[PDB]
């Protein structure tokens, strides 16, 4: 039985400890803000 | 109530009630809810941690109180948050009767957990004593199955 719903994104270490769950959450949020793999955007509202 | 109070305060203080982005963001940020913590009403008339040295004899030699085991035993414990439990002579426990009720009550507005008393299951599985909505004991399914199978019925 699932301890968390299927739509919850897994943010945890490979062992199962949540010591840096907020650190990983902040890393994912920074990735969502500006992904390092972001290519050449096409929008007219470019960041620069 | 608190949301409307904060909204009126901000409207009277810093909101121009125009189409500006300041007010447009305030109208949505003021809906956020603040921290709620049940603060017990302090008693400046009677300090419970002050009566520790009351109703005690003292040794004339060292001029300090006598650690009476009978007093330590019969001492009544009054609860408080910064001073978790305080011993007090049982003669003065009457003035602290309201602190007892405020401590026994769940530190939460009754209308937040009122969904308990509004159904039969929780009305039977929960306790309602001095407005303390603490869940009673409940056997596990394995436990009740084992009990019934041992009772052979």
């Amino acid at each position: 039985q699932r301890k968390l719903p299927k739509h919850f994104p897994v943010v945890q270490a490979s062992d199962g400890s949540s010591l840096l769950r907020e650190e990983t959450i902040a890393c994912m949020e920074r990735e969502r803000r500006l992904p390092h793999n972001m290519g050449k955007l096409y929008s007219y509202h470019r960041p620069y | 109530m608190f949301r409307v109070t904060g909204l009126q305060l901000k409207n009277p203080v810093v909101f121009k009630q125009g189409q500006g982005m300041f007010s447009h963001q305030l109208k949505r940020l003021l809906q956020k809810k603040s921290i709620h913590r049940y603060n017990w009403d302090p008693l400046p008339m009677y300090d419970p941690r002050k009566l520790v040295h009351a109703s005690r004899h003292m040794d004339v030699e060292t001029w300090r109180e006598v650690p009476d085991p009978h007093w330590d035993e019969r001492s009544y414990l009054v609860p408080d948050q910064m001073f978790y439990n305080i011993p007090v002579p049982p003669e003065y426990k009457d003035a602290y009767w309201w602190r007892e009720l405020q401590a026994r009550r769940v530190q939460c507005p009754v209308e937040w957990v009122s969904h308990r008393m509004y159904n039969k299951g929780d009305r039977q599985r929960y306790d309602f004593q001095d407005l303390a909505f603490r869940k009673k004991f409940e056997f596990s399914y394995e436990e009740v199955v084992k009990n019934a199978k041992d009772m052979r019925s």
């Binding site: 290519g39 050449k40 096409y42 929008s43 007219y44 509202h45 | -």
Partner: protein
């Protein structure tokens, strides 16, 4: 209590009077329409 929309696409579809804005300003002159250019992005950059 009313909203002002200067020039918005009609019922049948966006016309040239709005595509001019879409190509120059970057979005429709109302601001209520979100700029969505995934199709041309796929057609050119990808």
């Amino acid at each position: 209590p009313t909203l002002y929309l200067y020039r918005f696409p009609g019922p049948h579809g966006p016309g040239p009077y709005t595509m001019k804005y879409w190509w120059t300003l970057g979005c429709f002159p109302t601001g209520m329409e979100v700029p969505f250019r995934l199709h041309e992005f796929l057609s050119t950059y990808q």
